[PDB]
């Protein structure tokens, strides 16, 4: 199977962190591509990352790709994980998109960036500290953790953007960032340049 990625596209972050779960059941061929190459035959607009499966099918959803890698590792679907992933796609994503836009495209700083995601970050913090556990649904890092980490990393890598009152969110985030597959993905995707690598992608995106 072939995973298509592109430099500085934030969706490539969770899929690369998850891609190791595929280690036993399959070889994942990684193909670094351009940000406007249309790899999916039925999709008009280019999308990255994309996974081209051995069956000839295409996964074009980043969460579906991570789910597939975990399923290959023998992970089983659970309701709490579905809840987190649905919330990530529908609530977290639009908030993060506004924040990262404000941060990277318009050079805004501080609360002009954070304001967009404060509610979503608080939700994660609250859930992490309601339960007593260090992970989102599990007693060890799992699909929801990788998905949320991957979305959050481009903003929360700068500790100015992780509110000090949200200490539960703080630990969890650091714990995950200090895990090898995450470091590597972070390095692969962001080319160790903070959020600077993201600018070409974020500029093509619509203002709020």
């Amino acid at each position: 199977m072939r995973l298509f990625v592109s430099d500085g596209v934030p969706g490539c972050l969770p899929v690369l962190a998850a891609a190791g779960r595929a280690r036993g059941r399959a070889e994942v061929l990684i193909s670094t591509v351009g940000p406007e190459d249309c790899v999916v035959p039925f999709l008009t607009r280019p999308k990255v990352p994309v996974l081209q499966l051995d069956s000839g099918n295409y996964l074009f959803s980043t969460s579906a790709i991570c789910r597939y890698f975990f399923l290959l590792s023998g992970w089983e679907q659970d309701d709490l994980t579905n809840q987190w992933l649905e919330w990530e796609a529908t609530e977290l994503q639009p908030a993060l998109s506004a924040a990262l836009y404000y941060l990277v495209v318009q050079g805004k700083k501080g609360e002009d960036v954070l304001g967009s995601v404060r509610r979503a970050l608080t939700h994660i913090d609250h859930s992490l500290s309601r339960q007593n556990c260090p992970f989102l649904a599990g007693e060890t890092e799992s699909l929801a953790d990788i998905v949320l980490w991957g979305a959050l990393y481009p903003l929360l890598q700068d500790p100015a953007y992780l509110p000090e009152e949200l200490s539960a969110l703080h630990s969890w985030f650091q714990t995950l960032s200090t895990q090898e597959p995450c470091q590597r993905a972070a390095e692969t995707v962001l080319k160790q340049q903070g959020v600077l690598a993201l600018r070409p992608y974020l500029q093509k995106q619509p203002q709020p």
Partner: protein, 167 residues
């Protein structure tokens, strides 16, 4: 979009679940919330939908292999991010064109097996398909074929209007 409470009511009946649940709504987006007896509460249309499929002992509707499961969830996410959101608002037709290309060589969204993804995509697209002209339905030949098949699938359509297609 169809109100989530109503869509979950449809789904319950299509799954044969005799007792309809009572759902609450959370936040400005009216996200559905299910309180479970001797279980935790669940939030989100597709999250609750998958739980119901499991409650009906029809877990096969979530897909039967790692690949099929991933593809099902891809299309559920597609339903709640593209069909229910601005993508549909601003350009329903690019969505229909892509879906038409995708369905060229498939009976159901995953392939040869009917899944929860066909059900929810059918419910979510229904408001757009009912408004298509005769020529638009001929243009989106594959979407029409798929939609026509789902609207006639036992117990799925219920109270929803039938759309007329040419065979």
């Amino acid at each position: 979009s169809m109100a989530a409470a109503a869509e979950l009511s449809l789904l319950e009946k299509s799954l044969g679940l005799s007792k309809g649940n009572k759902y609450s709504a959370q936040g400005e987006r009216q996200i559905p919330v299910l309180q479970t007896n001797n279980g935790p509460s669940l939030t989100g249309l597709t999250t609750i939908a998958a739980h119901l499929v499991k409650q009906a002992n029809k877990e096969y509707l979530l897909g039967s292999t790692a690949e099929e499961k991933a593809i099902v969830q891809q299309w559920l996410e597609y339903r709640v991010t593209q069909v229910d959101g601005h993508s549909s608002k601003n350009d329903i037709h690019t969505l229909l064109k892509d879906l038409n290309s995708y369905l060229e060589d498939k009976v159901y969204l995953t392939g040869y097996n009917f899944t929860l993804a066909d059900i929810l995509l059918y419910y979510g697209l229904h408001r757009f398909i009912v408004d298509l002209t005769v020529q638009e339905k001929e243009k989106y030949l594959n979407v029409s074929r798929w939609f026509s098949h789902i609207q006639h699938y036992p117990g799925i359509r219920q109270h929803l209007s039938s759309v007329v297609f040419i065979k």
